[PDB]
């Protein structure tokens, strides 16, 4: 016979402890054990529990299969986090690991030691299992789809039919649900509270965030007014990804140096400017069409609870004291009279105000659903599908994957209802709520491709990387720095279990993991352009580049767009995500009184901000990025990688502290310790 004496170490997260039966089935070279108990003693949340069991040598220990009961009549949570194993055989001068990480239902499978591909040399035991476990996860892990034309999802009904392992923690479903909770509270008191005020100041939207705890005062909300800080949050605020570098006017923009001479201050004209790289420009032609609620059908004219969105064109200039300036607007797409150029020397100061506030309905709506929604939550959500469904669990990638894809099911699936659905937020707080969101977004997905995932070649094509030319742009140079560390360690993780290029080619999980979403995520569907995710892997290069777009944009890229959002919309002026009647077809018409009439409704308003509120909530059990402490990592050269990635991330962080030292308004959200892992709200 051999001893075997056995270590269970359970997870600290809630309920992940059990009183079901346990047990385990040792399997080696020799033969295997029967089931042997683990009976004395709790396993509690935390705990590390040790077990002395006898049965058959099995010689070197090949795999183990825990089994538990399930419970009994008083079992309130059967369900076992486990974080990994330990086992020492009396006949065997080695100690075997078995991660783990994952919920232990009824049964579970693990493996000793190292991440492998599917092509490294195991016991032929260990294959057969690995390959039960990917038709398993088949069952378990299925498409689904809003329509043709968006990125595929988890099936799914509710959140709490997800399996147990793509759920939000107890912890998460408790922040999440005491955010509505508080969020419902603080609107019903804050409606009590403003009931009959008069609405007829800019300055009565501040009483909006005042009873909220959200990490403080909006940092726009002193500055919101001035054309430098308006300039400044296409840059730095929530949607820093639509501005590009200007090297011609569009033709439907016909703005003339004699429009802006007066904005200019390097002592140059337009035409120079231009050339010289000082003018951006952003343009929201893709709203064209799109329905808002209550029925209006936006047109390249403009328009012919009824609510208003715009298409607007806005030109930018880099100032002499390196400030990004608004210096002409123009609210729809087709130029004319009754659609003419603003600018910040409009003979109406309220005209000026008003385009500001046009513009910024137009970005409030492409930020939240194409921007934010779409591009980092649904769209990424088709390659955390794939990764449950198509890496085994003991395959290298879905160990570095696994930290990260955390989250974007559980809320994703929480969102088709609450987020999108009919009657749901987005109904309620932004100008396309009603059913044209989804049609947006839609329209939007037809048009993404996996190259714009891919910070450094986007920022390059937008023609904004150059900081002699657009200087103050932290987004950029913060996520910059953030990119190149992932891009090292995920290089470096490549490099430890893929050999060559072949190797590569012949693992047939990678493979069909990006094919599944080449196929089944990100369909080329009619009407839509390639989104130029590859049907398979060629090299070590490429599955580095994919690997590192992606987990970026998990942690990163939903980071910089999301939490953002108190500072952005917090102020509703700032940002208003509504507007209530249609843009002017002359000049000369603007008063405070008919603007506040435009601008979003008190209610409205406050809406906004709880939904901000709940979407920016860190977890009490957020793991930031670079927290690895819950993965299922063995081998000795990829814990060497996550040091080294780690200490880089740290000199990131002292950095960007030492940087934002010097600033008026610090830039935060890219700091390493204030960004999850993963896109979970
Ligand atoms: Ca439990
Ligand atoms: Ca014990
Ligand atoms: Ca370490
Ligand atoms: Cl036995
Ligand atoms: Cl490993
Ligand atoms: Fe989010």
């Known amino acids: 016979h051999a001893i075997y004496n056995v270590e269970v170490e359970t997870g600290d997260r809630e309920h992940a402890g059990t009183d079901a039966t346990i047990t385990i089935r040792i399997t080696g070279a020799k033969g295997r054990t029967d089931y042997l108990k683990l009976d004395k003693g709790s396993f509690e949340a935390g705990s590390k529990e040790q077990y002395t069991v006898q049965g058959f040598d099995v010689g070197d220990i090949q795999l183990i299969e825990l089994h538990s009961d399930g419970g009994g009549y008083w079992s309130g949570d059967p369900d076992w986090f486990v974080n990994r194993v330990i086992i020492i055989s009396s006949t065997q001068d080695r100690v075997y690991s078995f991660p783990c990480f994952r919920w232990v239902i009824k049964d579970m499978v693990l493996f000793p030691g190292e991440a492998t591909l599917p092509f490294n040399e195991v016991p032929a035991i260990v294959s057969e299992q690995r390959q039960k476990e990917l038709e398993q996860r088949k069952l378990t892990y299925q498409w689904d789809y809003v329509s043709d ?47 009959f005020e008069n609405w007829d100041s800019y300055d009565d939207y501040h009483i909006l965030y005042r009873n909220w705890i959200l990490g403080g005062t909006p940092n726009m909300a002193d ?41 200019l201050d390097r002592g140059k004209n337009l035409d120079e400017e231009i050339k010289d790289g000082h003018i951006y420009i952003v343009d929201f032609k893709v709203l064209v069409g799109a329905k808002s609620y209550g029925g209006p059908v936006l047109e390249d004219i403009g328009y012919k609870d009824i609510r208003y969105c715009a298409a607007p064109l806005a030109l930018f200039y880099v100032n002499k004291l390196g ?123 037809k048009e993404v491709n996996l190259q714009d995932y891919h910070l450094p070649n986007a920022l390059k094509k937008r023609g904004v990387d150059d900081p ?111 507007l209530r009647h249609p843009p002017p077809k002359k000049k000369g018409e603007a008063t405070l009184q008919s603007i506040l009439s435009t601008l979003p409704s008190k209610s409205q308003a406050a809406k906004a901000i709880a939904t901000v509120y709940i979407l920016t909530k860190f977890s009490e059990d957020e793991r930031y990025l670079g927290n690895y402490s819950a993965t299922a990592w063995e081998d000795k050269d990829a814990l060497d990688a996550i040091n080294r990635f780690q200490d880089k991330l740290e000199d990131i962080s002292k950095k960007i502290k030492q940087r934002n030292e010097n600033l008026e308004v610090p830039y935060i959200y890219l700091l390493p310790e204030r960004i999850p892992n993963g896109t979970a709200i």
């Open 323 to 445: 400030h990004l300036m608004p210096i002409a607007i123009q609210i729809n797409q087709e130029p004319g009279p009754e659609n003419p150029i603003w600018t910040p020397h409009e003979e109406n100061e309220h005209d000026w105000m008003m385009a500001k506030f046009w513009l910024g309905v137009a970005e409030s709506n492409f930020h939240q659903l194409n921007t934010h929604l779409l591009r980092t939550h649904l769209t990424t959500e088709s390659f955390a599908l794939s990764t449950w469904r198509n890496l085994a669990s003991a395959h290298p990638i879905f160990k570095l994957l696994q930290p990260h894809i955390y989250g974007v099911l559980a809320i994703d699936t929480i969102g088709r209802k609450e987020l999108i659905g009919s009657g749901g937020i987005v109904d309620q707080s932004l100008s396309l709520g009603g059913g044209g969101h989804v049609t947006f977004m839609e329209k939007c997905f």
């Open 468 to 578: 002699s030319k657009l200087p103050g742009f932290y987004y950029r140079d913060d996520g910059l720095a953030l990119w190149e560390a992932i891009e090292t360690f995920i290089g470096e993780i490549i490099a430890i279990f893929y050999k060559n290029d072949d190797d590569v080619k012949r693992d047939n999980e990678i493979q069909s993991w990006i094919y599944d979403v080449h196929k089944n995520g990100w369909r080329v569907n009619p009407g839509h352009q390639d989104h130029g995710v590859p049907a398979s892997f060629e090299s070590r290069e490429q599955l580095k580049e994919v690997l590192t777009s992606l987990v970026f944009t998990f942690s990163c890229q939903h980071a910089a767009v999301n939490f953002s959002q108190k500072d952005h919309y917090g102020f509703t002026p700032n940002a208003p995500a509504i």
């Open 223 to 263: 500055r919101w007014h001035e054309d430098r800080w308006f300039g400044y949050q296409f840059l730095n605020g929530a949607n820093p990804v639509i501005l590009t570098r200007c090297d011609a006017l569009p033709s439907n923009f016909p703005v003339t140096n004699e429009h802006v001479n007066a904005s």
């Open 149 to 195: 034309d968006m990125p595929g999802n988890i099936k799914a009904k509710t959140h709490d039919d997800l399996p147990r392992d793509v759920q939000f923690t107890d912890e998460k479903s408790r922040s999440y649900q005491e955010s509505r909770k508080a969020a419902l509270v603080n609107l019903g008191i804050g409606s009590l509270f403003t009931m």
